[PDB]
Swiss-Prot record:
Organism of derivation: Homo sapiens
GO BP: cardiac muscle tissue development; detection of light stimulus involved in visual perception; embryonic organ morphogenesis; embryonic retina morphogenesis in camera-type eye; embryonic skeletal system development; eye development; female genitalia morphogenesis; gluconeogenesis
Name of this protein: Retinol-binding protein 4
Effect of A55T: In MCOPCB10; dramatic reduction in retinol binding; has greater affinity for the STRA6 receptor
Primary location recorded for the protein, binned into one broad class: secreted
Keyword Protein biosynthesis in annotation: no
Binding-site positions, substrate: Q98
Molecular functions (GO terms): molecular carrier activity; protein-containing complex binding; retinal binding; retinol binding; retinol transmembrane transporter activity
Tissue occurrence: Detected in blood plasma and in urine (at protein level).
Length: 174
């Protein structure tokens, strides 16, 4: 019944870059193929005088054969016609860390409590996503309040992802 076409997904109306700035803690993540960020994931968003948004991120990533490593990542966002949909160019401070360019959608936020992020890296031929990821962020590293949690689960469902998230732990690893 429900529409899982990416073109159908609602995003944050009149998204406000300035209100979104600051520290966000990742509480949950839906992983893409070849996942990168594992846990202890903390993002820092900024915006400059030109209205350009950027971010940094810290997190554990496990390179294969079980090598752990606290990644330090950088992101810069190019605006689109939709104030909540961006193109994110990202890279690591270390050259060998993953780089690329993903869609970056702010699906919902209230700025001071919760945020839901979404990226489809590759579409199916029917408009659904073939390879997606999503972060749920909290301003409080101890988690969301119940009201926010309930809103977020709804958004997760609307993205057709609700069954596919895992919790992100924060234990000072970085
Ligand atoms: C959306 C994450 C926070 C955005 C902050 C950008 C900092 C670099 C972003 C790195 C993108 C790589 C994370 C997607 C890959 C993954 O986690 O599986
Ligand atoms: Cl579920």
């Amino acid at each position: 019944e429900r529409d899982c076409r990416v073109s159908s997904f609602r995003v944050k109306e009149n998204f406000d870059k300035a209100r979104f700035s600051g520290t966000w803690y990742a509480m949950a993540k839906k992983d893409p193929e070849g996942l990168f960020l594992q846990d202890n994931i903390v993002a820092e968003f900024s915006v400059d005088e030109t209205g350009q948004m950027s971010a940094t991120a810290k997190g554990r990533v496990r390179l294969l054969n079980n090598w752990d490593v606290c990644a330090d990542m950088v992101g810069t966002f190019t605006d689109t016609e939709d104030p909540a949909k961006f193109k994110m160019k990202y890279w690591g401070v270390a050259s060998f860390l993953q780089k690329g360019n993903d869609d970056h959608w702010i699906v919902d936020t209230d700025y001071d409590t919760y945020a839901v992020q979404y990226s489809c890296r590759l579409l199916n031929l029917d408009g659904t996503c073939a390879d997606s990821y999503s972060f749920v962020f909290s301003r409080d590293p101890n988690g969301l309040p119940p009201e926010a949690q309930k809103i977020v689960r709804q958004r997760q469902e609307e993205l057709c992802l609700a069954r596919q998230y895992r919790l992100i732990v924060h234990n000072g690893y970085c």
